[PDB]
Write an enzyme that holds these catalytic residues in place. Structure first.
Site, PDB file in Angstrom:
ATOM      1  N   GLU A  54       0.825  -1.218   0.000  1.00  0.00           N
ATOM      2  CA  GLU A  54       0.000   0.000   0.000  1.00  0.00           C
ATOM      3  C   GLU A  54       0.857   1.265   0.000  1.00  0.00           C
ATOM      4  O   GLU A  54       1.890   1.318   0.633  1.00  0.00           O
ATOM      5  CB  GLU A  54      -0.947  -0.024   1.180  1.00  0.00           C
ATOM      6  CG  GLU A  54      -0.290  -0.075   2.507  1.00  0.00           C
ATOM      7  CD  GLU A  54      -1.210  -0.226   3.707  1.00  0.00           C
ATOM      8  OE1 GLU A  54      -2.065  -1.103   3.860  1.00  0.00           O
ATOM      9  OE2 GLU A  54      -1.046   0.674   4.533  1.00  0.00           O
ATOM     10  N   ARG A  65      -3.177  11.076   6.511  1.00  0.00           N
ATOM     11  CA  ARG A  65      -3.011  10.364   5.259  1.00  0.00           C
ATOM     12  C   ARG A  65      -4.297  10.274   4.493  1.00  0.00           C
ATOM     13  O   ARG A  65      -4.332   9.811   3.328  1.00  0.00           O
ATOM     14  CB  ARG A  65      -2.483   8.945   5.469  1.00  0.00           C
ATOM     15  CG  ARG A  65      -1.023   8.937   5.759  1.00  0.00           C
ATOM     16  CD  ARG A  65      -0.520   7.513   5.982  1.00  0.00           C
ATOM     17  NE  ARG A  65      -0.466   6.610   4.870  1.00  0.00           N
ATOM     18  CZ  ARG A  65      -0.763   5.347   4.661  1.00  0.00           C
ATOM     19  NH1 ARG A  65      -1.346   4.549   5.557  1.00  0.00           N
ATOM     20  NH2 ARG A  65      -0.508   4.788   3.498  1.00  0.00           N
ATOM     21  N   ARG A  69      -5.567   5.660  -1.636  1.00  0.00           N
ATOM     22  CA  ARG A  69      -4.404   4.772  -1.659  1.00  0.00           C
ATOM     23  C   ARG A  69      -4.247   4.089  -3.017  1.00  0.00           C
ATOM     24  O   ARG A  69      -5.221   3.953  -3.743  1.00  0.00           O
ATOM     25  CB  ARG A  69      -4.573   3.596  -0.668  1.00  0.00           C
ATOM     26  CG  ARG A  69      -4.873   3.977   0.784  1.00  0.00           C
ATOM     27  CD  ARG A  69      -3.663   4.475   1.541  1.00  0.00           C
ATOM     28  NE  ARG A  69      -4.012   4.726   2.955  1.00  0.00           N
ATOM     29  CZ  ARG A  69      -4.449   5.899   3.409  1.00  0.00           C
ATOM     30  NH1 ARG A  69      -4.600   6.945   2.621  1.00  0.00           N
ATOM     31  NH2 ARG A  69      -4.725   6.027   4.719  1.00  0.00           N
ATOM     32  N   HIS A  85     -10.700   4.435   1.529  1.00  0.00           N
ATOM     33  CA  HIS A  85     -10.047   3.674   2.550  1.00  0.00           C
ATOM     34  C   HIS A  85     -10.415   2.211   2.520  1.00  0.00           C
ATOM     35  O   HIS A  85     -10.737   1.548   3.516  1.00  0.00           O
ATOM     36  CB  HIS A  85     -10.336   4.257   3.942  1.00  0.00           C
ATOM     37  CG  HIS A  85      -9.339   3.860   4.930  1.00  0.00           C
ATOM     38  ND1 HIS A  85      -9.401   2.729   5.741  1.00  0.00           N
ATOM     39  CD2 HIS A  85      -8.187   4.456   5.316  1.00  0.00           C
ATOM     40  CE1 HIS A  85      -8.339   2.652   6.539  1.00  0.00           C
ATOM     41  NE2 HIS A  85      -7.607   3.708   6.308  1.00  0.00           N
TER      42      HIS A  85
END
Length: 96
Positions: A54, A65, A69, A85
């Site tokens: 990741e 963050r 991703r 997420h």
């Protein structure tokens, strides 16, 4: 399951930045970039432990963050984007 395929040019510009850093092996901005993604919920295809890693896609203005991703798989051009997420993923098409 994977939701479909999306062109790189249709994703936020920061996803292109993260993919460029993956190709150069960093340096990465976050300490969590490059850790193994366990796929504990079995949303992505079943693979051995360590198959997936990741990386952060920065969210402009965020203090944390955030929720975006890229997950890499070990196969050639196998990269998934999530903007929520890890709830949903799309395969990234770097050719468009």
């Amino acid at each position: 399951d994977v939701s479909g395929t999306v062109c790189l040019s249709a994703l936020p510009p920061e996803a292109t930045d993260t993919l460029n850093l993956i190709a150069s092996d960093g340096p990465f901005p976050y300490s969590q970039d490059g850790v193994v993604f366990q796929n504990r919920e079995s949303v992505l295809p079943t693979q051995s432990y360590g198959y997936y890693h990741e990386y952060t896609v920065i969210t402009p203005g965020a203090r944390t963050r955030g929720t975006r991703r890229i997950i890499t798989g070990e196969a050639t051009q196998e990269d998934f984007y999530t903007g929520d997420h890890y709830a949903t993923f799309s395969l990234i098409d770097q050719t468009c």
